[PDB]
Write a protein that binds this DNA or RNA. Structure first.
Ligand SMILES: [Zn+2]
Length: 183
DNA sequence: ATCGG
């Protein structure tokens, strides 16, 4: 029930400038009792520390660590929606671990909305394709998703969502890139 | 300004 600072949101989820951090706004909705809204929240990655020897944990793994805390009923079907700053990586095992989670728990269906494509990982295409081939929806965040996260996850205090310059442009471009990757 | 130093 603790919301997100507006400057952090507009700083990390900017699809024009790529940040050195990753945030993840997750929703968990029950499907068919009646369809309900059961869990919402957000988290961020754990920064890698060279001096202490810590390699860091990306936001996807940070969410996979939280799944036991959700008390998901194995008899019902849940839809998990991600609004992640960077697309999940491959070289560091995130896409593989998410695919592993999706295979053990077939009652959970995941859809991922990425604000930016993590093309720093040379195998980002293999990550997105692996996520698609595992039954998870892979999409790029558009204005509707940014405004949604602003209205439900951000402590806006009544201030409406003011889109940054190039939101629709970069969102369309990344949508085209992802459409070209998932062929 | 690409999961940070
Ligand atoms: Zn990762």
């Amino acid at each position: 029930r603790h919301l997100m600072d507006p400057h952090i949101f507009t700083s990390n989820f900017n699809n024009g400038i790529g940040r050195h951090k990753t945030y993840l706004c997750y929703e968990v909705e029950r499907l068919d009792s009646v369809k309900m809204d059961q869990h919402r929240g957000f988290l961020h990655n754990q920064a890698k520390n060279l001096l202490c020897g810590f390699y860091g944990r990306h936001a996807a793994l940070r969410f996979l660590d939280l799944v036991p805390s959700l008390q998901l009923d194995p008899a019902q079907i849940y839809r998990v929606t991600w609004f992640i700053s960077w697309s999940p990586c491959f070289s560091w095992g995130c896409a593989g671990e998410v695919r592993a989670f999706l295979q053990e728990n077939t009652h959970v269906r995941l859809r991922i909305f990425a604000a930016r494509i993590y093309d720093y990982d040379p195998l980002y295409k293999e990550a997105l394709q692996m996520l698609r081939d595992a039954g998870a929806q892979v999409s790029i965040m558009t204005y509707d998703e940014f405004k949604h996260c602003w209205d439900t996850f951000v402590d806006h205090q009544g201030c409406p969502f003011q889109p940054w310059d190039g939101l629709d442009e970069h969102s369309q471009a990344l949508s085209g890139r992802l459409r070209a990757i998932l062929q």
